[PDB]
């Protein structure tokens, strides 16, 4: 009874950051050999569980999340980090117990002219609670006068596009991130 780990990592497409997919894994036998013993994983770094100790344990629930971020924002997917994505898009609890996987996907997710299908949230009233997401796209209120749904002075759109092209350097190249969690 192998786990669908093959489907999560080899999915045809990953959702945007502000609408990260979440899949429930239970009642299965998990094999982490193919994950750690693969050179395609640029970053396999995690907290509270050593990677070699993964296969000798039992869990009650496995949660897998996925999205696509830039190369320079990978350091922000970690507990106790402050930044644009952590404060506004995807926040982890300080006592996080799970392994984060990310790798380059320039050849897949980036197209000449701009892949404007990837977005991120930039404006919000307050920071996000851990493992909490909001897909609401209401116009942001930044000034005193109510916006009433018209863009203009202090009424910017809360979403912006990364716009991947294969011309940028490694810093801006698309990365696909998988964030496993255990409990």
């Amino acid at each position, epitope marked *: 009874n192998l786990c669908p780990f093959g489907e999560v990592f080899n999915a*045809t497409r990953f*959702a*945007s950051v502000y*609408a990260w997919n979440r899949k429930r894994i239970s009642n299965c036998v998990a094999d982490y050999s193919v994950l750690y013993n693969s050179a395609s994983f640029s970053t396999f770094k995690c907290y509270g569980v050593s990677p070699t100790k993964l296969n000798d344990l039992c869990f009650t629930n496995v949660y897998a999340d996925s999205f696509v971020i830039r190369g320079d924002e990978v350091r922000q997917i970690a507990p106790g980090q402050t930044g644009n994505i952590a404060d506004y898009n995807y926040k982890l609890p300080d006592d996080f117990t799970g392994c984060v996987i990310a790798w380059n996907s320039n*050849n*897949l997710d980036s*197209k*000449v*002219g*701009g*892949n*404007y*299908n990837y*977005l991120y949230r930039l404006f919000r009233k307050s920071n996000l609670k851990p493992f909490e997401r909001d*897909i*609401s*796209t*209401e*116009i942001y209120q930044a000034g005193s006068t109510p916006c009433n*749904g*018209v*863009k203009g002075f202090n009424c910017y*759109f809360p*979403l912006q*596009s990364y716009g991947f092209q*294969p011309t940028y350097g490694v810093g801006y190249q698309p990365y696909r991130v998988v964030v496993l969690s255990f409990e």
Partner: antibody
Framework: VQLVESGGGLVKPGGSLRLSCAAS????????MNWVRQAPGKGLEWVSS????????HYADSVKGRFTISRDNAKNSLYLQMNSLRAEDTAVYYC??????????????????????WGQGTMVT | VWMTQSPSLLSASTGDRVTVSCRMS??????LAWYQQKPGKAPELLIY???TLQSGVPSRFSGSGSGTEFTLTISSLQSEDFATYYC?????????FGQGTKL
């Protein structure tokens, strides 16, 4: 980036016709191409598709197995062989380009664009 | 996936805030576009990826909503903005268009 079309016209039922969609200033040979039609007084309905490398082609459902799409990267021309026509197919046909590139012609990963530029249409009867 | 707009005859005065919805069946995230076809002419590309603006169009046209709902909001109707508006998903590979919204 000016798309021009030709062909079609008056034809007997059950006949065969071949259309042309030419490129006049861009790199067509490595863009994809798509065909969209509309009936008089109706909406738009998807018809066909073709990759830039001419390896992957997808057709519609109501016309599956009866149309053939082909392209020539040398002369920057696109064709659609249609045969065994009915009275339903009488409509206006546009050839639609795609917004953005993709270097790797991978299966189930092409043709996710938004039809950046269209043509002027014809009068297929 | 099957597209479903539910205006069919919506018409307003010169200058308003109309909202054309576009109901769907599955979840496609942000893979939905918008078109604008004047009578007897080829359609012109409008908001694509449900959030971007094609170069050239004014800022009075907006695209919002996420998940299985998408709406196009016009800030102020003018004489130029009187035509049909279609939907188009490109998640799977049937390309299901819309039905039509005559302003």
């Amino acid at each position: 980036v000016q798309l021009v079309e030709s062909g079609g016209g008056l034809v007997k039922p059950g006949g065969s016709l071949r259309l042309s969609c030419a490129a006049s200033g861009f790199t067509f040979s490595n863009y994809d191409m798509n065909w969209v039609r509309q009936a008089p007084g109706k909406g738009l309905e998807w018809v066909s598709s073709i990759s830039s490398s001419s390896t992957y082609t997808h057709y519609a459902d109501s016309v599956k197995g009866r149309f053939t799409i082909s392209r020539d990267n040398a002369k920057n021309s696109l064709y659609l062989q249609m045969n065994s026509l009915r009275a339903e197919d009488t409509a206006v046909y546009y050839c639609a380009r795609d917004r953005a590139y993709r270097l790797g012609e991978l299966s189930s990963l092409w043709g996710d664009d938004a039809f950046d530029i269209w043509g002027q249409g014809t009068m297929v009867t | 996936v099957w597209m479903t707009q539910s205006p069919s005859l919506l018409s307003a005065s010169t200058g308003d805030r109309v909202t054309v919805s576009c109901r769907m069946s599955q979840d496609i995230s942000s893979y939905l576009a918008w078109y604008q076809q004047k009578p007897g002419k080829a359609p012109e590309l409008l908001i694509y990826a449900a959030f971007t603006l094609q170069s050239g169009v004014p800022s009075r046209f907006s695209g919002s909503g996420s998940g299985t709902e998408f709406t196009l909001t016009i800030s102020s109707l003018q004489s130029e903005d009187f035509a049909t508006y279609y939907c188009q998903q490109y998640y799977s590979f049937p390309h299901t268009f819309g039905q039509g919204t005559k302003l």
